[PDB]
Amino acid sequence: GQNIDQPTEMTATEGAIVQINCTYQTSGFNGLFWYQQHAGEAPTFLSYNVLDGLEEKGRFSSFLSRSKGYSYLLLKELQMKDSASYLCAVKDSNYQLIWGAGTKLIIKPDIQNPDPAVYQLRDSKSVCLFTDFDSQTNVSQSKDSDVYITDKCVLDMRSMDFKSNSAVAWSNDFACANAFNNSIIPEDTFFPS
Amino acid sequence: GVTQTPKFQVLKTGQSMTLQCAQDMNHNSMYWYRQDPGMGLRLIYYSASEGTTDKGEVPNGYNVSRLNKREFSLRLESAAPSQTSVYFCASSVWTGEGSGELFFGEGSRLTVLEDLKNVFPPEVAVFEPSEAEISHTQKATLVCLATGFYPDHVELSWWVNGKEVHSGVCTDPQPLKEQPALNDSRYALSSRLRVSATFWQNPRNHFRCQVQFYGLSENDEWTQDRAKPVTQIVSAEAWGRA
Amino acid sequence: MRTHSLRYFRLGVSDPIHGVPEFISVGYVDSHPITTYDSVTRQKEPRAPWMAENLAPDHWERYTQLLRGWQQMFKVELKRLQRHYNHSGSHTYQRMIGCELLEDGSTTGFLQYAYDGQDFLIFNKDTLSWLAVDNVAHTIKQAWEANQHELLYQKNWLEEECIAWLKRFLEYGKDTLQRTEPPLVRVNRKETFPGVTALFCKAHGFYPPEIYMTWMKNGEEIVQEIDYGDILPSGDGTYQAWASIELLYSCHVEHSGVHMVLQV
Amino acid sequence: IQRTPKIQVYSRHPAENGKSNFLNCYVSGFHPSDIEVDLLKNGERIEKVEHSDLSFSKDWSFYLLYYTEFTPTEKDEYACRVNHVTLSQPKIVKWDRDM
Ligand SMILES: *Cc1cc(OC)ccc1O
Numbered sequence: 123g124q125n126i127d128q129p130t131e132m133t134a135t136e137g138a139i140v141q142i143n144c145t146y147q148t149s150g151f152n153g154l155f156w157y158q159q160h161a162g163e164a165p166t167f168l169s170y171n172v173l174d175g176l177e178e179k180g181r182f183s184s185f186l187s188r189s190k191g192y193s194y195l196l197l198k199e200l201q202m203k204d205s206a207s208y209l210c211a212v213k214d215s216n217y218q219l220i221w222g223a224g225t226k227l228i229i230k231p232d233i234q235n236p237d238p239a240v241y242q243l244r245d246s247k248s249v250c251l252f253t254d255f256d257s258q259t260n261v262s263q264s265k266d267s268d269v270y271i272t273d274k275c276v277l278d279m280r281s282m283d284f285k286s287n288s289a290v291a292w293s294n295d296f297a298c299a300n301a302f303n304n305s306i307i308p309e310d311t312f313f314p315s
Numbered sequence: 316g317v318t319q320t321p322k323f324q325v326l327k328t329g330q331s332m333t334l335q336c337a338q339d340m341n342h343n344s345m346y347w348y349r350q351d352p353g354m355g356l357r358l359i360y361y362s363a364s365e366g367t368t369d370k371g372e373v374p375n376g377y378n379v380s381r382l383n384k385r386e387f388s389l390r391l392e393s394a395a396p397s398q399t400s401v402y403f404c405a406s407s408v409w410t411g412e413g414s415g416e417l418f419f420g421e422g423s424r425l426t427v428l429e430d431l432k433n434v435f436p437p438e439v440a441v442f443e444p445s446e447a448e449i450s451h452t453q454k455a456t457l458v459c460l461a462t463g464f465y466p467d468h469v470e471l472s473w474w475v476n477g478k479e480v481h482s483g484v485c486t487d488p489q490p491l492k493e494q495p496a497l498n499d500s501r502y503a504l505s506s507r508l509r510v511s512a513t514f515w516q517n518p519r520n521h522f523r524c525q526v527q528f529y530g531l532s533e534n535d536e537w538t539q540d541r542a543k544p545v546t547q548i549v550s551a552e553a554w555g556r557a
Numbered sequence: 558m559r560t561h562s563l564r565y566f567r568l569g570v571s572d573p574i575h576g577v578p579e580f581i582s583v584g585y586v587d588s589h590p591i592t593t594y595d596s597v598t599r600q601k602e603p604r605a606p607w608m609a610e611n612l613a614p615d616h617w618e619r620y621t622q623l624l625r626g627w628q629q630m631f632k633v634e635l636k637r638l639q640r641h642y643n644h645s646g647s648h649t650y651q652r653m654i655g656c657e658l659l660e661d662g663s664t665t666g667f668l669q670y671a672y673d674g675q676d677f678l679i680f681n682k683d684t685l686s687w688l689a690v691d692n693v694a695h696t697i698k699q700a701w702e703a704n705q706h707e708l709l710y711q712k713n714w715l716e717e718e719c720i721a722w723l724k725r726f727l728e729y730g731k732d733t734l735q736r737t738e739p740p741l742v743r744v745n746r747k748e749t750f751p752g753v754t755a756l757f758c759k760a761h762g763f764y765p766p767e768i769y770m771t772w773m774k775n776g777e778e779i780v781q782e783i784d785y786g787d788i789l790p791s792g793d794g795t796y797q798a799w800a801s802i803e804l805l806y807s808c809h810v811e812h813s814g815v816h817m818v819l820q821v
Numbered sequence: 822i823q824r825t826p827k828i829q830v831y832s833r834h835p836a837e838n839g840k841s842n843f844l845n846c847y848v849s850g851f852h853p854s855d856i857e858v859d860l861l862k863n864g865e866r867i868e869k870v871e872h873s874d875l876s877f878s879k880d881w882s883f884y885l886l887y888y889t890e891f892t893p894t895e896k897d898e899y900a901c902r903v904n905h906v907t908l909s910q911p912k913i914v915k916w917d918r919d920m
Contacts, residue, residue, distance in 0.1 A: 126355065150718055152413045153710055161488045164403065164419035165356075170706050172413060172713045188717075209355070215718065216619045217411040221355030239451065243442035243458050246553045251445075251456060251507075270491055272505045277485035279454075279509060288485070290458055290505040314447035343626060363626035369618070409630060411623045413710025566877040568854065577855045583877060590874065604874070649853055651881050671881040674852035675822060761834070791833045792843050792871075792888045 123148020123214040126222035133228040134200055135257070142195040142208050142225050150215025156184055156195045157209040159224065165209055169195065197227075202276060202285070205229045230257040231276050231285040239312035242298045250298040253288035255308055261289040262305040269293040271302070316340045319404045319420030323468050323529035323546075325434060326394040326427045334389040334423050336404030344410040345387035346417065347371070347379060349400040356403070362387055363410040396427045424529075426466040431535060433499050434544040436528045437461035437469060439551040444515055455515035457553065459506040459524035463493065466502075468529035473508045476521050483509040516557045523552040559765065559813070561587055561734065563723035564655035569631040571639060571648040580628040585655075586726045587734060588766055594624040607730040638672055641693040648673055656719035658727075666715030682712045737813045738764040738795055744808055744819045756821060758808035759786075761797035766790075769811040770800045776807070824882055825907035826851035828914045830900070836893050836919035844891045844916065846901035849884035857904040858887050861913070862897060893918065 125147045134140040153172035157165035171186035183196040210222040236256040243249045264271045271291045278285050291301040319336045343364040348356045358371030360379040404420040444455035490502035530544045537543035568581045584592040590604035601620040603609035635650040651671040668680040679688040685708040689695040740763035749755045766788045786799035806821040827850045833843035860867040873886040904911040
């Protein structure tokens with residue numbers, strides 16, 4: 123065939139539902155595959171459809187409409203561990219696999235008690251931490267360079283059933299008060315004196 | 316079921332390289348893919364069954380040999396920078412079966428450079444919990460920083476009292492570029508381990524941030540004054556303080 | 558439009574005597590060969606000029622690789638069958654897959670296996686199951702039926718892929734496959750054994766090979782013995798056939814929507 | 822269950838002595854596939870003979886077509902000679918001269 127399209131990226135909330143579409147324009151059709159690929163890992167097979175209908179395997183379902191050149195992968199009761207890339211692939215007339223470029227799925231944790239804050243950490247032998255904000259907050263990169271800001275990262279303290287967002291900022295003039303100016307942060311963000 | 320080596324390799328341009336893949340599932344078909352950002356998997360060569368192979372979509376610069384039923388080798392003839400990629404070996408029971416899925420190896424991360432002189436291991440530093448956070452949240456966050464490394468060949472882990480921990484940890488999925496504009500920028504990577512304030516305040520709790528770096532091998536020759544940037548572990552650590 | 562069909566055969570021969578390939582695979586559209594492959598050339602080749610002209614070299618290249626794999630599969634399957642039956646020596650394994658596009662636009666599809674030239678397994682694409690002729694075939698059946706997705710893949714291939722391939726090939730070879738060459742038909746009369754007159758109605762020069770021929774008495778159907786000649790290739794792309802009886806008689810012929818009557 | 826070949830020998834066009842034609846031999850319904858076919862003129866093998874590839878029937882048997890250009894005469898006897906594992910010796914099947 124010629125072409126497979128699936129979104130570059132999708133974001134949804136923990137506990138909810140996401141549908142990942144894959145359309146294909148191929149010369150012939152011999153089945154559609156979905157693969158899960160965690161960051162830094164190998165793809166693993168999730169599903170196969172070749173006739174019309176929906177197949178459920180646990181929290182994951184795969185749907186195919188041959189008439190519309192269309193499939194989706196449906197994930198229910200989203201968990202953080204569903205964060206991964208999902209690869210759509212179609213076998214054509216000559217049994218060749220045509221691969222879409224993958225959909226990265228980002229899962230937003232459900233933050234029960236937001237406590238937005240920027241703390242200063244000093245070296246053992248320095249660094250700023252934007253943390254405990256709610257998941258609608260977005261972290262922008264820096265303008266002034268030799269100044270580094272990482273993306274949001276969700277940690278899970280399993281034994282306390284507690285998740286939290288954070289992002290790190292560091293440099294070598296630089297101040298934690300200033301650190302996340304390029305980003306739009308909660309008005310009530312705690313800045314320790 | 317699919318075993319693939321090496322997981323990491325640094326190459327100088329013009330070096331030749333063989334990647335090995337073995338499969339003990341008595342599968343008949345094997346495949347070599349490269350995976351590059353922003354596109355789908357691309358087939359380099361494949362082997363429909365023992366005793367035959369054929370070009371995939373991007374064969375140039377490579378060749379392969381189906382050694383036997385189990386093994387499918389991938390060769391880089393004269394390594395070029397554009398061949399910097401993540402390589403995946405795969406097998407299926409047959410080819411031209413409809414439903415037969417692929418089984419993938421763990422993947423091979425290959426970096427091809429003009430010279431080995433920009434290869435650098437990371438510097439590692441641990442940053443202790445601010446006591447403002449401890450007062451405010453009664454939780455303690457430790458931050459690890461691996462900086463100045465090249466290429467992007469690291470695996471960061473946390474170790475508490477000589478044992479590796481996964482709970483309360485989050486590590487950036489990918490490094491950032493210390494010099495965004497340079498094509499050979501070095502990288503930085505941050506991570507966080509959060510514990511209870513009480514756990515941190517326990518003076519005999521030992522925290523170590525560990526970074527495995529994949530660099531040059533014994534084989535690679537090195538004539539510079541700085542130490543040869545071989546594969547190595549670099550750690551930084553901290554003890555609890557009331 | 559008339560009925561057309563697409564058929565692919567595979568023939569696997571155990572420990573072949575000098576000469577005969579271990580594996581042969583040939584495709585047909587109607588009665589015309591269109592593709593070939595065997596274990597001696599190890600190459601996929603066109604067997605009709607309208608296939609060669611309309612399929613670029615990378616198609617032949619791709620299917621060369623697929624048949625080499627199917628050859629290996631066929632070899633192994635035959636070995637397992639021989640073991641199940643406790644057979645030694647040289648045996649044969651055959652496969653036939655294909656589809657038909659009927660006049661009325663409806664379709665058929667079939668997939669069958671034979672062992673030593675006899676039915677072995679017959680696929681039923683409507684209940685997705687395999688019909689087994691004996692206990693050995695039944696063993697293979699349970700194996701194939703355990704793979705649900707694979708059963709669905711095959712139904713899809715017979716109902717959709719096969720039909721699409723067939724339509725594609727029909728278009729490629731239309732000047733050959735959709736043409737009509739009407740029959741030349743004659744009736745011969747002769748006294749044979751004393752008192753026994755034989756009537757032969759003989760046709761030749763026609764294409765497609767499908768032709769209907771019969772003898773009537775006084776315009777109503779004969780309830781006497783009619784002998785039938787096979788429809789045989791004349792070597793020039795056209796076919797010949799006949800029907801005969803003993804002794805108001807007339808031969809009726811239908812070919813490609815044209816009816817013909819020859820009165821004795 | 823082996824199946825011995827049907828052998829049919831016949832001209833392309835209705836035959837007339839003196840006029841150029843083609844002699845066909847259609848060998849069919851045999852199993853297994855190994856087979857040998859020759860066209861004969863007066864007992865002797867004809868050297869310029871075309872044939873189709875081995876072909877497959879839905880009933881799992883095989884078939885073949887051998888033919889040669891010929892000009893039939895009263896004097897000349899044509900036949901098709903076939904060997905197959907079902908046969909103790911090659912079967913020589915005479916053309917019936919389009920009787
Ligand atoms: C040999 C072949 C087979 C096929 O479908 C089974 C399509 C095209 C070619 O060439």
